[PDB]
Design a protein around this ligand. Structure first.
Ligand code: JF1
Ligand code: JF1
Ligand code: MG
Ligand code: MG
Ligand code: MG
Ligand code: MG
Ligand code: MG
Ligand code: MG
Lengths: 306, 306
């Protein structure tokens, strides 16, 4: 697999090492890992590393929040593969009022008090910006177990669905929170088109590198929770080609989305519309795209199936 | 300008392309009814016999002119149907069907009728058995041109399935065998179904990429039904949410994957000991179609000037 040239240069948060030890150490202590092999596989994945690649300009005292959130979402994302759609739904829905803080967690159940203490600590640091991450997360959670995964999809209908499943909206809200970057409602409405374009890039790039992992999961895990739902699968069906052939095609498509990103930003600047905050925001989106690809290229999570 | 990705296919042209072109073009210039001198010059500029010689390079010398005449009149009719409705276009094609069979005498005052009649008569006179095997594939194509599914929303997969008839895969397959005198058993013709379906996608999309600008303008001036925009370029552009130009580049990469799959199915057919001498010439002939179609679509004034 040889990716076509990109002009996006990845950046990593300077405190990636010490934050990784802090966050990984927290979960290694509280999260219920089945065995030592799973604990090693968890650390080898580098969940704090990809977070620092996603938000390399996050505030030094806020990056750990983003690392914790993505880490626990990664862990749950794997757990749902062994559940049914019904079981997965009940699992996620129980965490939602706990995320809001309306329901106290069962402190004998790790996933509950980890989720609870997280959002409680995020509200203590920045209450307003933390609340604006809630619903985007819930939107992503409820999309994970939507039965539309089991029904046939075209490329467009899939990309429209994956925008929720890849958590584009939560990642955007997390980025703002981590950077302290507040944007007016009108400002967010201007980059709505740029957000939708960024989502397709994050989704497909992930689909390309994580296909072999998700292929194996669909054959060994739960037939519903581990169902093969990816652009690589769908494009291979539509065009009747191998999955490897679909990857090469989807990669060219990703570069076109990068090209569109630059065009949409340029138009935003041509018109007197790119505010200083919007300038920082769209740069952050590029860091997400380039950071996602860098990590996906190198992370053990996608390279060792075992 | 659009740069085509590398291909291993070497396009071939029939060695009698110069004489047959001047011959067939001369025939239609004597006989067909053109609105003005501008249309007469544009007809010659298209090179309808050139593409036929690129399609069927290893055709017999005394049969290549038949294919040039058939594809030429089908090209002319295809353009006429864009100024009609689906109901008018159907009535136009259906009246020419029993004439093609030879059951109904043509109106000698109407060019399209006696041109088609005399054509199929001369074809059955040269090789009755093989000429008859092109009838239903042609009718299948003619009835696909006014299929009301053109005014229906289609995904990439559904489009490619429909286009196999609209691009006239079978008629091009039967015409090729006729022009080469290549007879195949029903067993042989069944073994290469997958290769035919794969080749059909290549012919369709390659044509779509270069003829998009022509068909875009037709959709803006052409009759709303008969001139409706129906192409993979538009479909991928709206599904992936990119420009038509961006869709062309991605579709072109996909076409190269279909070339790889062609080589794959051919080698697999041979490895299973199913490749008869007649089948070797067939799958090679399909390659000449795919490469020949690309060469012509790159250089013809039919697509470059609108
Ligand atoms: C931050 C990422 C690497 C994205 C890619 C996949 N993961 C899966 C677990 C849940 C995350 C929000 C995400 C969808 C984000
Ligand atoms: C021989 C070709 C260039 C193919 C591409 C388009 N044309 C349109 C007119 C009718 C032909 C059969 C064809 C579909 C074939
Ligand atoms: Mg997953
Ligand atoms: Mg997932
Ligand atoms: Mg994945
Ligand atoms: Mg047509
Ligand atoms: Mg046409
Ligand atoms: Mg076309």
């Amino acid at each position: 697999l040889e990716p076509p040239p990109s002009t996006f240069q990845p950046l990593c948060h300077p405190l990636v090492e010490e934050v990784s030890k802090e966050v990984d150490g927290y979960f290694l202590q509280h999260w219920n890992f089945p065995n030592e092999k799973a604990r090693k596989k968890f650390v080898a994945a580098g969940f704090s590393r990809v977070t620092c690649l996603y938000f390399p300009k996050a505030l030094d005292d806020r990056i750990h929040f983003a690392c914790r959130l993505l880490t626990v979402l990664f862990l749950i994302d794997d757990l749902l593969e062994y559940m049914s759609f019904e079981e997965g739904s009940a699992y996620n829905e129980k965490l939602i009022p706990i995320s809001r803080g309306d329901v106290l967690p069962d402190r004998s159940i790790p996933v509950e008090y980890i989720i609870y203490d997280l959002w409680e600590s995020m509200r203590a640091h920045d209450r307003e910006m933390a609340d604006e991450i809630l619903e985007p997360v819930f939107l992503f959670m409820r999309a994970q177990t939507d039965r539309t995964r089991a029904r046939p999809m075209g490329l467009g209908g899939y990309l429209e669905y994956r925008e929720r499943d890849v958590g584009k909206e939560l990642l955007a809200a997390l980025m703002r929170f981590s950077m302290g970057l507040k944007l007016s409602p009108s400002e967010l409405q201007r980059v709505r088109e740029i957000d939708a374009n960024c989502s397709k890039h994050l989704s497909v790039v992930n689909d390309i590198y994580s296909y072999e992992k998700e292929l194996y999961t669909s054959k060994t895990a739960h037939s519903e929770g581990g169902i093969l739902c990816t652009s690589v699968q769908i494009l291979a069906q539509e065009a009747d080609v191998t999955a490897e052939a679909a990857k090469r095609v989807l990669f060219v498509m990703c570069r076109e989305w990068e090209l569109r990103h630059q065009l949409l930003v340029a138009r935003l600047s041509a018109e007197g519309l790119e505010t200083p905050g919007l300038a920082a925001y769209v740069e952050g989106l590029e860091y997400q795209m380039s950071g996602n690809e860098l990590w996906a290229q190198t992370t053990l999570r996608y390279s060792v199936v075992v």
